[PDB]
Amino acid sequence: PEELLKGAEEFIEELIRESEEGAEALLQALEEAIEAAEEAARRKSGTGEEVGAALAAAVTEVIAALSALLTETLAHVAALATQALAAAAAQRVPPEELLKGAERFIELLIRLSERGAEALLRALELAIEAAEEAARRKSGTGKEVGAALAAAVTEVIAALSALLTLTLAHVAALATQALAAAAAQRVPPEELLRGAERFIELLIRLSERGAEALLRALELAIRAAREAARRKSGTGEEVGAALAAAVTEVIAALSALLTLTLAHVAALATQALAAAAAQRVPPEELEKGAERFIELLERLSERGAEALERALELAEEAAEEAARREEVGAALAAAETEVEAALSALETLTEAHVAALATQAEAAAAAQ
């Protein structure tokens, strides 16, 4: 009956909490190797400095374990959804409950991505906390310790950018099958146009929270570079250029996330405006749905430009701190040209998604 979607909703919620426990177990096993490797760094008469590379190896394999766990959990949620959406439609449940049931299942997927991004960032934080207690007595040079840190940064950026790419796709897939299973039950087409608007707004909220995870990864990189001057191990040329690299990776990960999110929203809108003209929706409402989808595409554009602006605001703040401790002005200038190129890329991608969504909308109003 109507309790099927409740049985799936509760079964997904426990599945999310079971994934949260597993990620905390993965992060605890990392901490068991942080404290143990400290005892291994006890005036090493044999294996020395090898515990540092074996610690960065453990970081890489914990990050990979986190990424794999999120990937599988997202699929068990999306699969449990898709089969529950169809099992309920077979029971001939009211179709308005299928769209609202898909929206709840999409919410849990986005909360899964939020919990996951925190674990990815916390593992990066444990890796930094390890370096703040490293190079104390053995005094591993800023080159050996800083390389393992910059490598952990780009692996976290890649696990975050990946996690967002997958999560977007599982939401966009659910929104596609749910829209089609609704039109199969002859939903009033106006409700199909609105259901797509709700799912689009969940997509944009996924982009916003995803951009925050990237920005906070940039902050852990800036903080990790400040630790370089503390132990007096690195230089101003190596740890500065290493942070300049993490800046570039965050910009390109943000712009990639925005490019993808624009495309998933435009793809969902085109498939929704088309599935509505099938049931012959009033053309006036078809021209209204195209207008709101257009607005949502532009809102996503700004909310992304703010994230790109915040990456610059973190770059300038790190620049004034590194100057109060030339090359610092060239780093600001390079981060500014990279930022502006991403803003330009964003506006030219946005307007094209908006214009293309209007040309296909007019074609649907002319087929009337």
Side-chain angles (χ1 to χ4, degrees), residues 1-31 33-37 40-41 43 45-49 52-136 139-142 144-185 187-323 326-368:
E2 294 74 30
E3 318 265 53
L4 271 181
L5 294 183
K6 255 307 296 170
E9 185 199 350
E10 78 97 32
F11 218 63
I12 290 175
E13 289 162 16
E14 258 61 45
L15 180 62
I16 306 299
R17 193 217 92 205
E18 188 248 306
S19 178
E20 296 161 352
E21 158 215 298
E24 266 301 327
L26 288 173
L27 272 45
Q28 281 274 6
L30 210 175
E31 245 279 15
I34 298 297
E35 213 285 310
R43 296 246 280 265
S45 61
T47 55
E49 207 264 355
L55 196 62
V59 169
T60 300
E61 300 158 66
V62 163
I63 296 176
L66 284 149
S67 194
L69 172 62
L70 298 171
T71 298
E72 278 161 329
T73 298
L74 283 154
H76 284 103
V77 172
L80 250 52
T82 51
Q83 286 181 128
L85 274 312
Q91 317 275 175
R92 205 182 164 200
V93 296
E96 293 78 24
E97 312 182 26
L98 297 180
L99 288 320
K100 296 194 294 124
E103 173 188 345
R104 179 52 177 169
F105 294 150
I106 287 166
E107 294 177 10
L108 312 182
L109 286 163
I110 299 174
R111 226 163 75 193
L112 204 173
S113 175
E114 289 178 347
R115 268 52 171 182
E118 300 179 32
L120 281 172
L121 290 154
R122 184 68 183 95
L124 171 54
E125 193 176 42
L126 291 164
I128 297 176
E129 292 181 357
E132 306 181 332
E133 266 74 11
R136 282 184 164 272
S139 295
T141 320
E144 284 111 28
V145 64
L149 265 55
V153 177
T154 177
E155 291 170 350
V156 168
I157 297 292
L160 287 168
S161 167
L163 172 66
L164 297 169
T165 301
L166 301 170
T167 298
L168 284 160
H170 287 97
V171 162
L174 262 185
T176 293
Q177 295 169 107
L179 261 44
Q185 291 193 324
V187 170
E190 301 77 31
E191 294 189 313
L192 248 68
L193 283 316
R194 279 184 279 114
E197 188 209 3
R198 200 80 269 285
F199 300 151
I200 281 181
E201 291 179 334
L202 295 168
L203 281 173
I204 304 171
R205 189 153 167 269
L206 213 179
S207 185
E208 296 189 29
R209 218 54 46 91
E212 299 176 19
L214 287 179
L215 287 172
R216 181 52 53 166
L218 169 62
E219 306 211 16
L220 290 172
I222 294 179
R223 172 196 147 175
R226 295 177 178 170
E227 178 65 23
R230 288 319 177 197
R231 41 174 202 275
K232 133 80 199 132
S233 293
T235 55
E237 50 180 357
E238 230 297 329
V239 319
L243 216 174
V247 170
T248 306
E249 301 172 15
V250 167
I251 309 292
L254 289 164
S255 69
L257 166 63
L258 298 170
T259 298
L260 293 173
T261 301
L262 285 165
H264 283 102
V265 169
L268 232 191
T270 54
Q271 287 186 285
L273 295 175
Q279 297 167 333
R280 279 288 60 179
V281 83
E284 306 85 21
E285 301 162 344
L286 203 155
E287 297 144 0
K288 295 173 106 301
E291 199 254 0
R292 186 67 172 105
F293 298 157
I294 277 176
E295 289 176 354
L296 294 162
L297 282 169
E298 210 271 292
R299 179 100 190 96
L300 168 69
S301 181
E302 171 46 74
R303 282 263 97 193
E306 267 164 38
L308 297 175
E309 285 281 3
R310 189 65 208 180
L312 203 171
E313 292 181 355
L314 277 162
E316 55 99 337
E317 291 167 8
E320 291 154 25
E321 299 222 345
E326 203 206 341
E327 56 192 2
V328 302
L332 187 166
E336 237 286 352
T337 34
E338 295 168 338
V339 154
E340 289 299 322
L343 273 324
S344 166
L346 215 179
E347 301 310 311
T348 180
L349 281 184
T350 293
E351 296 195 43
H353 280 274
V354 187
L357 191 50
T359 60
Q360 311 191 62
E362 163 51 46
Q368 161 266 355

